[PDB]
Amino acid sequence: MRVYFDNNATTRVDDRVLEEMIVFYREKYGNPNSAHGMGIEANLHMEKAREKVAKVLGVSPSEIFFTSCATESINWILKTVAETFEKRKRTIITTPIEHKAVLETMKYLSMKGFKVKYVPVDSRGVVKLEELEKLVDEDTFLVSIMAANNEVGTIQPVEDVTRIVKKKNKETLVHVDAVQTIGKIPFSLEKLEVDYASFSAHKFHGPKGVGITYIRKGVPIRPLIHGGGQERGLRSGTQNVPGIVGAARAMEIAVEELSEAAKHMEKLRSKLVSGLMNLGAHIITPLEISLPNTLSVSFPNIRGSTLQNLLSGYGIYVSTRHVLDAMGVDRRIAQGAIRISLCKYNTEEEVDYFLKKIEEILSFL
Amino acid sequence: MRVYFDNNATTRVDDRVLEEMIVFYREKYGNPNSAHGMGIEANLHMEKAREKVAKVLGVSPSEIFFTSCATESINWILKTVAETFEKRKRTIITTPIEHKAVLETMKYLSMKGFKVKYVPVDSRGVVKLEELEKLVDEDTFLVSIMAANNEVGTIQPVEDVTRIVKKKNKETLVHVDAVQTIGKIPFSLEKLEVDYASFSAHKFHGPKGVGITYIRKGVPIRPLIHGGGQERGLRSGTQNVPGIVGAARAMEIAVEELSEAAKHMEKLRSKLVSGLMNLGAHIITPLEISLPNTLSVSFPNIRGSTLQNLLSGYGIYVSTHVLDAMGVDRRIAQGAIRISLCKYNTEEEVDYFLKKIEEILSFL
Ligand SMILES: *Cc1c(COP(=O)(O)O)cnc(C)c1O
Ligand SMILES: *Cc1c(COP(=O)(O)O)cnc(C)c1O
Incomplete structure (x- = not known):
């Protein structure tokens, strides 16, 4: 066995996801940026996927961005947000139990001159809220927490972390690595009050090669990938249409069940x-x-x-x-x-x- | 019709490409970084893909890297090569007919303080070799040229461009956007003497969401995407196994026919x-x-x-x-x-x- x-x-x-994806490989294979019929058709389904993801997450379609993976989404957010704060702010806070996507990026930002502080966790793997309150200062522009740990499964108190961070510094942005949430525990960004969030479709029966990013309207962000102008000019390169369609369907099914x-x-x-x-x-x-x-x-x-x-x-x-x-x-x-x-x-x-x-x-x- | x-x-x-991909979605879906049997199986097929691509392009498997698209590859190469030359060299040379993936990255590097020079093209869209020889200098660390223009189709003199660039400054690195080559014109990097090249699988009957990057053994490069250590620590994120396997099969087919x-x-x-x-x-x-x-x-x-x-x-x-x-x-x-x-x-x-x-x- x-x-x-x-x-x-x-x-x-998921077999239901794969079936939908095949259509875009075999029939509706147009480039979503092309102005012709097959292009407008592909663009339609890509936008329908974006809307489906936004609905599941409780946000606006304009706040959903597609990337190649959560690791890309994380590099994008952490590195470009930092870039917008250069010369101005310099302190970033996260935890020592974060995925390497976050840790290796923080290690890179440290080398570039940023000050990365690490909030310790207790023996069950839960972030120490009292130490978080102390570490957050006026020079802190971004706090990156995970919704649940991938190795041991410990769920983090994102709401308390957000509330505590806002009280200590109203301007500090919050990024949530929400990769392990979809299909395992309930997760809505509707009333969560976070600024950025990362997801990976292959963790919820979606295909590999697709990441999903939530970026609250108006918050700081710059392109990690420059080019043709895809994804509202923030992430260029031809969109993985079949992947995007499968991922959205996968997310919807995961949350529904x-x-x-x-x-x-x-x-x-x-x-x-x-x-x-x-x-x-x-x-x-x-x-x-x-x-x-x-x-x-x-x-x-x-x-x-x-x-x-x-x-x-x-x-x-x-x-x-x-x-x-x-x-x-x-x-x-x-x-x-x-x-x-x-x-x-x-x-x-x-x-x-x-x-x-x-x-x-x-x-x- | x-x-x-x-x-x-x-x-x-290509139907033959899709048939191979489906196996990786349904059966061989392990994470290629996992130490167990399904991980080994995925890693194996992923390495076969890398080898198949290397063989087609006439290079070593260790010089092939997989990305999400040619745009990512282009950003990766231009931005990190420039990063390694910060406070050392500052001039980059390209043409005005390059794809926006290249032009927008140059616009970004320019804003960051680099000196981007644009070698003009003739009325047929061919890069002016005489002007190239003139523009390349000692502060020039990289030259980015395309193998063929996507809008009008104009094939560029890549060999001449490399030859002219090396004679003027033996240290200058060359990147070739080779996206429009595969399956249309012969393209081998075996004796081309370039340092980097970018490809996009969806331009040759491979799937969207997959980019192929050639990086000459030893040349400068840093990660554009930091994380778990995938792609020799140079491009992290769970690898798109179905796509990689499909893209390699597509490249093999494209060149074979x-x-x-x-x-x-x-x-x-x-x-x-x-x-x-x-x-x-x-x-x-x-x-x-x-x-x-x-x-x-x-x-x-x-x-x-x-x-x-x-x-x-x-x-x-x-x-x-x-x-x-x-x-x-x-x-x-x-x-x-x-x-x-x-x-x-x-x-x-x-x-x-x-x-x-x-x-x-x-x-x-
Ligand atoms: C898997 C995972 C990631 C990285 O996902 P990739 O799809 O490999 O980019 C990041 N964070 C957490 C918590 C994860 O479980
Ligand atoms: C299509 C194209 C690109 C970009 O490919 P993406 O797959 O969209 O990243 C880059 N250069 C040329 C010459 C192209 O034709």
Whole structure:
């Protein structure tokens, strides 16, 4: 049996999404910027996708931008916003549990002369709100937080972070890496009061090669990619129409089936939690404040990679750092840590299979 | 019938290409950076794609990088190469007929304090070699030239350009926007001696959302996209595996059938040229030094947009600074439409095009 439990790394495209995408590869393949009939037709569907994404997120179509991935969206926002504040402001705040897309960009901005401060997180991986309040100063133009951690699944208090940041400095902008939200926990930007947000379609059964960016009307931004003038002149290059259409459909389906999908994942996760603890596993993920499909565990007596390799040999796929370290997790636990991440298509039969095979693997070791 | 003559704007994905892509959406959907079996499988196919592209272009697999589009590649190269020369060198040279991906990036680098020089082109759209030799100096760290113009089709003397540039300053790097080459004219980087080149899969029956970048082993480059470490740490973000696999297969097919395709397109283009000239059309495209599929024509006293609009109504798709750089008269420019064929266009479509465009000219 093939058991894919690494959905936080990427997901299989939904059959409904793929079907819609094929139309744009085979029939409506026009360039959305062309003034002719096939061009206007492509542009129509691209705009319909943008509107569908805006509706799901609760924002205006004009605030939705398409990129090649969330990593691009993140580089774009962090780097161009910084660029608009050069000579004026110099302080940026984020957390040490952010994805490398954010961290490596912050590392780059540091080299360029910016001051990046890191708000620590507690042992459950939740940002320390009291330390955040202190770190935010008048020279702070941007705060970048994630809606949920990809490795351990810890959900962050975005609303409190936004409220606390605005009270300490009304002008500070907030960016939310919202990649792990869609289809796992509810996420609307309608009343969230953030300025920028990043999403990746392949994390919610959408295709790879497509990122989604929310940029609040009027906030700072410049092009990371200059050229033909696509995306209101802010991100040039021919738009990945098939991808954009699939991604929008994927987002809509993910949010529409959220309630049922979340209950189901939460249920499969509880079966995994108990079955693994009974085999000697330490649970790293804080179950009460985490994505319902995510479960980071550890068998301290075994290297995570060794466990990962053996599971893969049995047709079971899981994944295997800077996050656990920031959480104060013991090095021995971190060394044997593996991440199990479900999707709406995972079943109880796969969980039973996973528990049975992992027990065998463990007895041989 | 439906006649798509706007292949230089984008093309329909080859059925053979799409068939391969579908496998990566449905079955082999692992993250190529994942350490497990599905990750290894995706990484494997992604590396095969890289090798297939390297083989086609005559370079090493380690010199091939995948992006989201040629525009991203162009931004990546121009912006980060310039970044490495900050406070050292400050002059960049390009032409006025370059695609906006290049011109807009130059406009940005100019605003950032770099000195951008523009080598003029002749009335046929060919870069003036004498002026190039003159403009390149010791402060010139990079020269960006296109292999062929997308609007009028003019093929540029890339070898001469590189040769002239190296003799004047052996340290100057050369980037070639090679987007309009693949599947239209032969293009190998094996003995070309350039440092960077950009390609766009959707211009050769590959998917949209995929760019191919050639970076000579050892030349300057920094990440435009920082993050997880993908593409040798030079371009992060989860790689578009289905697209990469599709783009490589498309490139392989395009080049493998270039000989037959280019002759077929040239035959179709000549029939179009004669038919259009026998209707009063001025031919803006230099037939002697241009892509075999491209034809920029203009009817006196008829706006290109109007002509394009009517052609579209008849199920015929064509498109409407390059002309300004070539010295083309305003009136002729305003009437310009661009016809661009692909290997799948037919003689039947050309006849239909000629018959309907005449009918249209009578109503206008
Ligand atoms: C996957 C992920 C990213 C990066 O997505 P790419 O699609 O690879 O660009 C960024 N942030 C988080 C939280 C992620 O899970
Ligand atoms: C189409 C084109 C580009 C841009 O390609 P995108 O895929 O839209 O990034 C760049 N240069 C030339 C010559 C082109 O024809």
